[PDB]
Amino acid sequence: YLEAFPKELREYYKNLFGKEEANKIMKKLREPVEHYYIRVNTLKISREKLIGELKKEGLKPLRSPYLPEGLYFVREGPNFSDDFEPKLPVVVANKYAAESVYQGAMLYAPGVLKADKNIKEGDEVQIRDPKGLLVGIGIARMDYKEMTEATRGLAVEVTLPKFKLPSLSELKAFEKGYFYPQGLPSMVTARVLEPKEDDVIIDMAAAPGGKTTHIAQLLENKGEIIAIDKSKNRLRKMEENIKRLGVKNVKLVQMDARKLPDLGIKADKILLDAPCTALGVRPKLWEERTLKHIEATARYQRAFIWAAIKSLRRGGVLVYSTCTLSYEENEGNVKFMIRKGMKLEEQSIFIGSPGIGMNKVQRFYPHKHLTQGFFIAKLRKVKD
Numbered sequence: 001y002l003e004a005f006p007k008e009l010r011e012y013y014k015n016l017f018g019k020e021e022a023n024k025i026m027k028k029l030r031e032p033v034e035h036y037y038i039r040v041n042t043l044k045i046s047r048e049k050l051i052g053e054l055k056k057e058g059l060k061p062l063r064s065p066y067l068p069e070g071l072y073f074v075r076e077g078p079n080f081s082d083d084f085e086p087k088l089p090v091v092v093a094n095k096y097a098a099e100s101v102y103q104g105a106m107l108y109a110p111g112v113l114k115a116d117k118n119i120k121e122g123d124e125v126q127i128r129d130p131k132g133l134l135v136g137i138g139i140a141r142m143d144y145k146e147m148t149e150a151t152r153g154l155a156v157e158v159t160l161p162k163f164k165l166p167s168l169s170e171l172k173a174f175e176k177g178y179f180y181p182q183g184l185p186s187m188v189t190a191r192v193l194e195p196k197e198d199d200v201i202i203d204m205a206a207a208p209g210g211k212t213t214h215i216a217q218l219l220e221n222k223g224e225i226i227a228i229d230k231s232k233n234r235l236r237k238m239e240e241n242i243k244r245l246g247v248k249n250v251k252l253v254q255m256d257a258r259k260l261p262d263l264g265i266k267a268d269k270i271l272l273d274a275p276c277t278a279l280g281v282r283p284k285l286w287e288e289r290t291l292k293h294i295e296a297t298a299r300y301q302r303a304f305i306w307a308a309i310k311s312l313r314r315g316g317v318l319v320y321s322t323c324t325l326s327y328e329e330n331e332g333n334v335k336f337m338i339r340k341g342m343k344l345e346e347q348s349i350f351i352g353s354p355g356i357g358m359n360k361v362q363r364f365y366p367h368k369h370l371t372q373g374f375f376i377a378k379l380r381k382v383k384d
């Protein structure tokens, strides 16, 4: 698994976590989350009612004892060994198709990069990513010719994915806005913010609106949430998410969040779920980002943070979160905040790990908590 991570990053992890822990983290990072979480949209349905609906569809949702809005599905796999060499013709899936097949998706024709020319419908085939990673085994539903030419349709029925997570996007329950797939750490983040119907609230990197819509249901669609993002497309997706979930609580504004103080607003609550190197996201087939990215991105985040601090009322609260493992983007950037008149505060839910040499922030690790790598800091603005 070590091969998935560039050498300097591997050394970075070893230095930051220790060899043993670093190896455990990288090993687990290569795999999908063991517990696949969704958020119950309490704007439309209760937890137990939704469970009833999911059991109807043959699913086995389990309840979280920490998040009353949390449900998770247990992951299946690995369905074959890491060294397994099937005696099968090869279908090569592109980078994006391979990651979904790796988690139980079918392989569709646009997801096909190239393939063995002997392949005919009904043949048993093995599916590999462009770098030779075996991600699944299945049965071809197209001949070679159609597989490499079709613009749509089913190319390989994946009957033996490396791992299996439930597909929920096609469920009626999903279409009716009953839930939103979202990781446990991300859900804890919105809770730890403790939004109140009275609060002036800003999500300054909000799209596609996972944490924004969670705030909306915690507010029970009362008050107002200001949601910022620079990307019009991701905002477009956020508009669809809002409509589907029945969220009436949110005001979308497109802009560079680093210029936030240009508004006249002094917020009581700010969520900064910041753009990051995403070193913690799963599954991690091949890690492309490295040290140069950590420094650059950490520096990039400081612009957001400063903008947030200046836009916070005194006594105001900032929640900073990332889906990355790096020190610089996390504990390092919190020290920055501490130098700018912010103070660490106890988080209302703490089920993760302590931060690196730092007491009140909350970290999540894949090998310890069965989640994506994650980071959460909660701060109080004591002065300007």
Ligand SMILES: Nc1ncnc2c1ncn2[C@@H]1O[C@H](CSCC[C@H](N)C(=O)O)[C@@H](O)[C@H]1O
Pocket (backbone or CB within 6 Å): 186, 204, 205, 206, 207, 208, 209, 210, 211, 212, 228, 229, 230, 231, 234, 255, 256, 257, 258, 273, 274, 275, 276
């Ligand atoms: N300079 C900038 N100003 C505002 N938003 C930015 C930005 N640079 C990146 N972003 C946005 O920051 C987001 C980080 S992903 C955040 C996901 C979101 N909080 C959720 O829970 O669903 C991306 O959507 C990206 O569009």
